[PDB]
Design a protein around this ligand. Sequence first.
Ligand SMILES: *[C@@H]1O[C@H](CO)[C@@H](O)[C@H](O)[C@H]1NC(C)=O
Lengths: 53, 49, 437, 53
Amino acid sequence: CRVPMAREPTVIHGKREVTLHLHPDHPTLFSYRTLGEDPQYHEEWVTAAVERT
Amino acid sequence: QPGRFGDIQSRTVESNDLYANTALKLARPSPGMVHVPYTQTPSGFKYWL
Amino acid sequence: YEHSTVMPNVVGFPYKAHIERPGYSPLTLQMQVVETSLEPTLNLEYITCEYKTVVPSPYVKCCGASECSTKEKPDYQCKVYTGVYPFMWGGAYCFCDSENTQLSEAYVDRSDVCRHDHASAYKAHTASLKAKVRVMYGNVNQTVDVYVNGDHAVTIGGTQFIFGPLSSAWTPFDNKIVVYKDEVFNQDFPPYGSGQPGRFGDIQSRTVESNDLYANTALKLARPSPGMVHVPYTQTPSGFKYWLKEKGTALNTKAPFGCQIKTNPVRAMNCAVGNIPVSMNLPDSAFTRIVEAPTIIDLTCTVATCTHSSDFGGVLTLTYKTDKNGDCSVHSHSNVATLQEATAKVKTAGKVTLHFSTASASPSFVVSLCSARATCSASCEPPKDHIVPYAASHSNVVFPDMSGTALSWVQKISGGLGAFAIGAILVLVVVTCIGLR
Amino acid sequence: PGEFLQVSIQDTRNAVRACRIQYHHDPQPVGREKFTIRPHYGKEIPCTTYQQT
Ligand SMILES: *[C@@H]1O[C@H](CO)[C@@H](O)[C@H](O)[C@H]1NC(C)=O
């Protein structure tokens, strides 16, 4: 079954962080995690245009 | 900048300069069909509204 | 010839090993891991899916009575209701008014699609590592599959490689896991024969093709309303569908060291942890007599630029006096600076330049051509870009070498304070010895 | 999506005969995006249907 692919966000490099502008056409799942010993993750369903740090 | 107020600008209404930064991008078509796939950030005027 | 090194378990890191066999020119080995797979041993406990409630047509005994009869069905219920007057359709279906009984029964089954849609409760024990390493040296560029324990030997170009047991026994999985489709959950499931209604495990089965069908769904049976043929009942809704909505977050979303949890063979791929001991047995034909390698005398090293970034941000130049054109092998004798090249081309001109990577503000290390050695000292500057899409080419050895700018100051103030203190001690000792007589 | 299901036919006398039941029916597609209609450009993911054989 065919599925779409979300358009790439806008990435803004900061000091030990980034900021993303997410523009969804419909509810889209967004998650992240750090690649260390204590992962520090998060998941969230995104329904409108938001900015995430 | 793309997706925020002012991603396209004209010096006047009737001008013909049109700065545009909308992060337009282009992609390879799927095997066996005729189309022009692309992605770009949706308008920053509608975001500002 | 026997040699033994220790390479880190990082995918993509270029490791370079140096073998100094007297009477022969030194050799530098290139070997890096391409991918790494970690698989535990899994014992199936049971299989769970959603259930199906089987409800037959009710037996109405006009002008009489009937009795129950227990059966061996899963979660089975049977009841007899005394006085009913059904009114089936276009009539009454009975003739006696209050001497008619209805027999109601129901039982729990397994879903018609339990083969395709089911979860699996497992028990996970000691895991086996298996990596994939590319070896480059001389004129060979092979990559092999190897088990990372001291019990597998692979041969590349006549050399014997054994990749020893990893230095740590870390595992991402716990003792109890659940595997649904492509995702794994560190979940503590109920034992077999101990499920509860409306939660995970309300119906359990030993295997997808088993027949036991243990069931605990709190099915209850009710009395039909007057004047109509039907069997009402009450049941707690399926616990598999409750789990599909409440099953927290998978192991895929949260896993240390960037492990990637994968399909039918449950495995965690490309976890950056531990060290991999390596043992080698090189043939004599893989070396070179010193009477065939250029003789290099009076090597000196001076660094042009240095930037302690993730990439190869340093450059150093080496000056030498040779006697013929040929290729030597270069190496760094510290992990505070990682060379990019394994070999150089030696010319009479007396110049060769190499790139390196570091994280120190002031590194110091020994570089060596095929025969001679030199000491390189540098003053490096931090980068200005914040984020990069790739990983460091160095080991995060930050502590600066002495005689650098930072520690020269510490030594200078230490010397001043110590001179003052010993002056105080000497003055006191002389005064007290004079006053002691 | 809806809150009930109704099926009906047209009998020999041309009178509508219907049955209505309570069914939930809120479906979601496969993947990480809650689209509604398949695009002309996208990805492919395994899906399960009812084959018409
Ligand atoms: C070894 O082979 C791989 C793929 O065939 C290639 O990418 C790599 O550059 C080769 N190594 C050398 C030193 O040429």
